[PDB]
Amino acid sequence: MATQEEILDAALVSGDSSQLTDSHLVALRLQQQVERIRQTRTQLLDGLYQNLSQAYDPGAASMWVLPANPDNTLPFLIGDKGRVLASLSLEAGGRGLAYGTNVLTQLSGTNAAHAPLLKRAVQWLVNGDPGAATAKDFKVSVVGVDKTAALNGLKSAGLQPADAACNALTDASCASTSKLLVLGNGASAASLSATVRARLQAGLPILFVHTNGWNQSSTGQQILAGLGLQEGPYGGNYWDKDRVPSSRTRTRSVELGGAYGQDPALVQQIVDGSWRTDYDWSKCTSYVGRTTCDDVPGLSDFSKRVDVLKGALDAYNQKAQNLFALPGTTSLRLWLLWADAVRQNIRYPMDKAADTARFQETFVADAIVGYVREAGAAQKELGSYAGQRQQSMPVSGSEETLTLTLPSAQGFTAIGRMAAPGKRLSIRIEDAGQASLAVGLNTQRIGSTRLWNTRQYDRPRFLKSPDIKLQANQSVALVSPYGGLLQLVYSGATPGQTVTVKVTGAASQPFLDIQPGEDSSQAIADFIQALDADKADWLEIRSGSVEVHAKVEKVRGSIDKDYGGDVQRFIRELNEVFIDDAYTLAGFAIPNQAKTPAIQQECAARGWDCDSETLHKLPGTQHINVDQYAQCGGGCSGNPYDQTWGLNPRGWGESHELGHNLQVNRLKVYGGRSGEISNQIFPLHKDWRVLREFGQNLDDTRVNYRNAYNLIVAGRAEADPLAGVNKRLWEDPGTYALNGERMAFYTQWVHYWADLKNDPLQGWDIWTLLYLHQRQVDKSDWDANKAALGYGTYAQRPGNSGDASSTDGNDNLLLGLSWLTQRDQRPTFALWGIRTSAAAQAQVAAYGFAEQPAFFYANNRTNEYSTVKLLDMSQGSPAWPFPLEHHHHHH
Ligand SMILES: [Zn+2]
């Protein structure tokens, strides 16, 4: 029925791009509109400038003042370095001008040359025409900046203003009689932004001067917002000292101001299809399978122009502003609808050489997504991100209420619902306390769109939305073209607080929400049933301080591969063998889980606090993304950390990487030298557990006892035996240097503790105890607790350096280990080439323990401790006591 022309016109009002498919049509309209704006700008600027001097130097002590909506705001003065030093506003049908410094008191000094242009700008403010004289004694209200100095400035520019002698900012009758309001940052008013806007809308011209030099100003920001302008970033003009030179021409300033925050060349390119056919892709590089193209000539400049558009639209997304409910946003509306229209046409996969036109146009459209609206369109093809299930997910007509717990002060947490593609969702938050909140969609890192890899432009570049700010008790309506996992983004929260999320129009992905310390068997059954229905492409799991955001087919693949399709057993292992294993090893205070009897008892014997939230609360969330692609490689560090293989509760990588989140500097030998070592206790512990509890032998050659021994025996023969071992074991700075040999130091203490306790099952408690000890060392009141912690001799809390040249880690390890074992461990530290400070050595001497003579635990397997052998290193070095497993040695 309706033509595309008709669909476009209605879409411009409503934001409803559902039926809009002709991108070329929208693009012609955008071209006309961008040309309207350039014509309107250039006539205004040309009228302002004429052949007057363009010289304007605001100095280092000044601020940049930027436009926002390109249809109604624009630069006035752009320096040679491209910084906007003053801007013009026609917002709300008004007239305003804003400068980054108080130019009015410089019109007889540094900026005498600017005075004639300033007079034309005032004529434009007062009369709407830069060549129309002001009346003699025209009434000017000056508020928030020195009145006499401002009025004298205007006089020295050849104007004849008279003091209005009333306040046109705060008094609406004064406004109606006044010809101009001049504002500075000393102003007082109720609802300053709205008040400025009201005056502007009513037809009072406004001239703002920034009065705080290179300092930012909240009052300044609020005035600018009322004008529809933007305070520049921190530091102002302090570094660049940008200025407009005397040599600047009318033509050039008209061109720069007409072009600012506009891209007619891009719009033409779109309209004509003139996408670049000859990028030199040979200049792309690849790194562990990911191709990037930063050095392809021309490409960065193009990508940065597309970033401008993305940044301009995302500024509205972030503040929860609906462009279609804001008057005079036509250019931006047209960009948004153009990109929605492209999205009806996208087809995957694309390749950077084979499909230059579709690839480049998509590259642009993907950058332009308006989330805050009452209606919109789904992208037709979701490629490697999702498919028909995501597209068809049902949504709730009624409002659902969700209670979320924030585990730390800052981060994000899964809400447990999705936006469905093209479907309006409404959301709000209540009972936030002092937490600052936003909503976001999806968790993908941008490297997981592999668009520069051959034929892998197969999903949107920006699956994760901007963070959309929320206010207590105010609803926001969203439509996403992709659908997505809703996240609650938070800062300034109180660990353990809750937030109430009310949402209407959301879909319900399979979501497993383990309730801390409560029975979960119903939640699991409900999750399994949701998976069985197979109505989603994405699922989430929240289990303790871990949240998993996962493509269903990837998780299904892991369950099918390693669990024979048994979703229950997979979940149990994920919760227990993976997650709980790690958090319990690190000794955190886990709801409704007591410490084991041996840990309980040792904590009482040491008289320690091993249970308070104050000291041992669970840390903030570690997120895991499971997807077809990762930020880097086939999996990548971070938070979230990314992986593409699935999700393996028994995996080495999963626990190694979780282990990074749980590292602490005071348990690292030589700082960064243990940056890939001290986290290894997590996967090692898990493998020890897996071999015992399941009979499966994983990664059984990780701990290189044999070569650690070789290096120790060779090193200790040197004149300085500690330095000799240090050189051989800890000196190499390579990321995974001597990884297996350094790990063997960490396990020494496990075998020692098992022997000391006379219980082969207790060995790993030493690491849980050191963790407990360290968090007290880190946060307990020093004078009151140092004796219990074995730090009696220290006037102050030790340092927390992670540097390889620091002894902070070595020292605390030496003290914790000596104190817990109740033996002086200096001789085994020396054996391993590990130096400690004089302070720490004195503390160990203070304990008055018997030395533990140097010792070394040797094994020819990592996971099976029953064969470990204890070597006395105190008088010499015995021969390595093992053959190699399943090996034929030389006769
Ligand atoms: Zn690592």
Swiss-Prot record:
One of its GO terms (cellular component) is extracellular space. The active site is at E657. One of its GO terms (molecular function) is metal ion binding. GO terms for biological process: negative regulation of leukocyte tethering or rolling; protein catabolic process; protein secretion by the type II secretion system; protein transport by the Sec complex; proteolysis. Belongs to the peptidase M88 family. Keywords: Hydrolase, Metal-binding, Metalloprotease, Protease, Secreted, Signal, Zinc. Proteolytic activity is blocked in the presence of EDTA. It comes from the Bacteria. SMART domains: M60-like. It is found in: Secreted. Residues 410-754 form the Peptidase M60 domain. Zn(2+) binds at H656, H660. It is an enzyme of class 3 (hydrolase). This is Immunomodulating metalloprotease. Pfam families: IMPa_helical, IMPa_N_2, Peptidase_M60. Its EC number is 3.4.24.-. Protease that degrades several proteins of the host immune system. Cleaves P-selectin glycoprotein ligand-1 (PSGL-1), leading to its functional inhibition; PSGL-1 is a leukocyte cell-surface receptor essential for leukocyte recruitment to the site of infection. Next to PSGL-1, targets host CD43 and CD44 that are also involved in leukocyte homing. Thus, prevents neutrophil extravasation and thereby protects P.aeruginosa from neutrophil attack. Is also able to inhibit the decay accelerating factor (CD55), but not the cell-surface receptors CD46 and CD31. Its cofactor is Zn(2+).
